Amino acid sequence: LKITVTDDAAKKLQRYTDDSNAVLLLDFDDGVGALSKVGVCSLNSDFRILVVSKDMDYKKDYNEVIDSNIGKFYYKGYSKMYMDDNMKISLNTNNSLLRLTGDNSGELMPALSIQDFRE
């Protein structure tokens, strides 16, 4: 899986990618995973970005990787079925939220939020 992040979107994610101790997760909010037990959870099985530290246990669950121009994105293997091979994260022109689209599915998540679960 691959993801392209626009300039405006990367800039908005800069404050996190700048944290050497930070890791990005493309989470499928379904209550599955130890991380769901941390922080808010809208268990409506939707996509969202989570930022954790390299000390939290995200490995066992977010067991797969997505290559991207701003670094890696970890995700739960199974949710792969809800993704696209070539996706994109851009910045909404209407609101300050991000957007997640796929080459074959179109909009996967029109309003992609960001959650900071770093200690």
mmCIF file of C-alpha atoms in Angstrom:
data_model
loop_
_atom_site.group_PDB
_atom_site.id
_atom_site.type_symbol
_atom_site.label_atom_id
_atom_site.label_comp_id
_atom_site.label_asym_id
_atom_site.label_seq_id
_atom_site.Cartn_x
_atom_site.Cartn_y
_atom_site.Cartn_z
ATOM 1 C CA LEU A 1 0.000 0.000 0.000
ATOM 2 C CA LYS A 2 1.112 3.514 -0.839
ATOM 3 C CA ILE A 3 -0.030 6.978 0.179
ATOM 4 C CA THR A 4 0.690 10.383 -1.311
ATOM 5 C CA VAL A 5 0.449 13.376 1.041
ATOM 6 C CA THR A 6 -0.067 16.819 -0.556
ATOM 7 C CA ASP A 7 2.067 19.764 0.530
ATOM 8 C CA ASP A 8 -0.731 21.394 2.540
ATOM 9 C CA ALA A 9 -1.459 18.107 4.294
ATOM 10 C CA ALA A 10 2.158 17.332 5.106
ATOM 11 C CA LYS A 11 2.568 20.815 6.524
ATOM 12 C CA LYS A 12 -0.393 20.226 8.842
ATOM 13 C CA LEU A 13 1.261 16.973 9.934
ATOM 14 C CA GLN A 14 4.684 18.540 10.335
ATOM 15 C CA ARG A 15 4.340 19.067 14.100
ATOM 16 C CA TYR A 16 4.030 15.287 14.462
ATOM 17 C CA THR A 17 6.449 13.950 11.853
ATOM 18 C CA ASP A 18 8.996 16.235 13.540
ATOM 19 C CA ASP A 19 8.790 14.110 16.691
ATOM 20 C CA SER A 20 11.570 11.515 16.303
ATOM 21 C CA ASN A 21 9.724 9.583 19.010
ATOM 22 C CA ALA A 22 6.472 9.710 17.042
ATOM 23 C CA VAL A 23 4.773 7.078 14.877
ATOM 24 C CA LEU A 24 1.724 7.512 12.629
ATOM 25 C CA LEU A 25 -1.190 5.136 12.446
ATOM 26 C CA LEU A 26 -4.006 4.890 9.939
ATOM 27 C CA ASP A 27 -6.512 3.455 12.370
ATOM 28 C CA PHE A 28 -9.761 1.701 11.588
ATOM 29 C CA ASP A 29 -11.910 2.736 14.542
ATOM 30 C CA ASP A 30 -13.647 -0.525 15.401
ATOM 31 C CA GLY A 31 -12.578 -1.125 18.970
ATOM 32 C CA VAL A 32 -10.043 -3.752 17.959
ATOM 33 C CA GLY A 33 -6.507 -3.262 19.298
ATOM 34 C CA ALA A 34 -4.916 -2.185 22.576
ATOM 35 C CA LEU A 35 -4.847 1.392 21.319
ATOM 36 C CA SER A 36 -8.612 1.541 21.127
ATOM 37 C CA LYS A 37 -8.456 1.292 24.960
ATOM 38 C CA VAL A 38 -6.536 4.552 24.992
ATOM 39 C CA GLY A 39 -8.242 7.837 24.173
ATOM 40 C CA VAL A 40 -11.625 8.540 22.557
ATOM 41 C CA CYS A 41 -13.337 5.959 20.369
ATOM 42 C CA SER A 42 -16.109 6.513 17.879
ATOM 43 C CA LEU A 43 -16.498 2.814 17.198
ATOM 44 C CA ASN A 44 -18.222 3.494 13.877
ATOM 45 C CA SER A 45 -15.507 1.590 12.014
ATOM 46 C CA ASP A 46 -14.106 4.649 10.282
ATOM 47 C CA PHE A 47 -10.647 5.876 9.316
ATOM 48 C CA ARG A 48 -8.657 8.305 11.398
ATOM 49 C CA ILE A 49 -5.031 9.218 12.065
ATOM 50 C CA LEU A 50 -3.497 8.344 15.404
ATOM 51 C CA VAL A 51 -0.127 9.504 16.630
ATOM 52 C CA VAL A 52 1.605 7.504 19.322
ATOM 53 C CA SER A 53 5.120 7.212 20.720
ATOM 54 C CA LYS A 54 7.572 4.448 19.925
ATOM 55 C CA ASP A 55 7.054 3.158 23.466
ATOM 56 C CA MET A 56 3.321 2.390 23.278
ATOM 57 C CA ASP A 57 2.254 -1.054 22.085
ATOM 58 C CA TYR A 58 1.004 -0.386 18.574
ATOM 59 C CA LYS A 59 3.166 -3.003 16.921
ATOM 60 C CA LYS A 60 1.206 -6.171 17.670
ATOM 61 C CA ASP A 61 -1.973 -4.622 16.257
ATOM 62 C CA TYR A 62 -0.787 -2.080 13.672
ATOM 63 C CA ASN A 63 1.238 -4.848 12.095
ATOM 64 C CA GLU A 64 1.471 -3.580 8.542
ATOM 65 C CA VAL A 65 3.032 -0.588 6.863
ATOM 66 C CA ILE A 66 2.085 1.938 4.241
ATOM 67 C CA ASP A 67 4.908 3.753 2.445
ATOM 68 C CA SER A 68 4.511 7.503 2.050
ATOM 69 C CA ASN A 69 6.413 10.657 1.210
ATOM 70 C CA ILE A 70 6.310 11.871 4.819
ATOM 71 C CA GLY A 71 7.333 8.643 6.502
ATOM 72 C CA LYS A 72 5.590 5.422 7.472
ATOM 73 C CA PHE A 73 1.970 4.756 8.392
ATOM 74 C CA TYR A 74 1.181 1.672 10.439
ATOM 75 C CA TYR A 75 -2.176 -0.061 10.247
ATOM 76 C CA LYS A 76 -4.045 -3.135 11.396
ATOM 77 C CA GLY A 77 -3.542 -5.809 8.781
ATOM 78 C CA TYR A 78 -7.205 -6.723 8.364
ATOM 79 C CA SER A 79 -8.393 -3.175 7.704
ATOM 80 C CA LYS A 80 -6.392 -3.508 4.496
ATOM 81 C CA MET A 81 -9.661 -4.738 3.003
ATOM 82 C CA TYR A 82 -11.119 -1.274 3.484
ATOM 83 C CA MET A 83 -8.273 0.507 1.767
ATOM 84 C CA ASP A 84 -6.976 1.168 -1.734
ATOM 85 C CA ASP A 85 -3.529 0.323 -3.134
ATOM 86 C CA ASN A 86 -2.802 3.922 -3.994
ATOM 87 C CA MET A 87 -4.363 6.438 -1.676
ATOM 88 C CA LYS A 88 -4.120 10.120 -1.014
ATOM 89 C CA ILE A 89 -4.302 12.446 1.954
ATOM 90 C CA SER A 90 -5.129 16.029 1.087
ATOM 91 C CA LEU A 91 -6.426 19.097 2.897
ATOM 92 C CA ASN A 92 -10.072 20.133 2.691
ATOM 93 C CA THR A 93 -10.694 23.537 1.177
ATOM 94 C CA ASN A 94 -13.851 24.043 3.257
ATOM 95 C CA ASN A 95 -12.714 23.043 6.737
ATOM 96 C CA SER A 96 -9.300 22.430 8.295
ATOM 97 C CA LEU A 97 -9.659 18.657 8.153
ATOM 98 C CA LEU A 98 -7.786 16.162 6.027
ATOM 99 C CA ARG A 99 -9.269 13.966 3.332
ATOM 100 C CA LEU A 100 -8.508 10.344 2.509
ATOM 101 C CA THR A 101 -9.174 9.204 -1.049
ATOM 102 C CA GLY A 102 -8.239 6.129 -3.075
ATOM 103 C CA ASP A 103 -7.520 5.657 -6.792
ATOM 104 C CA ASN A 104 -10.208 3.010 -7.161
ATOM 105 C CA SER A 105 -12.647 3.791 -4.336
ATOM 106 C CA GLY A 106 -12.747 7.568 -4.486
ATOM 107 C CA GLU A 107 -13.423 9.226 -1.150
ATOM 108 C CA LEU A 108 -12.681 6.718 1.590
ATOM 109 C CA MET A 109 -12.937 9.326 4.328
ATOM 110 C CA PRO A 110 -14.006 12.896 3.464
ATOM 111 C CA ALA A 111 -13.134 14.236 6.925
ATOM 112 C CA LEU A 112 -10.020 12.525 8.276
ATOM 113 C CA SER A 113 -9.309 13.573 11.874
ATOM 114 C CA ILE A 114 -6.080 13.452 13.830
ATOM 115 C CA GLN A 115 -5.677 12.084 17.339
ATOM 116 C CA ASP A 116 -2.629 12.733 19.504
ATOM 117 C CA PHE A 117 -2.235 9.847 21.935
ATOM 118 C CA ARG A 118 1.428 10.553 22.674
ATOM 119 C CA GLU A 119 2.414 10.416 26.316
#
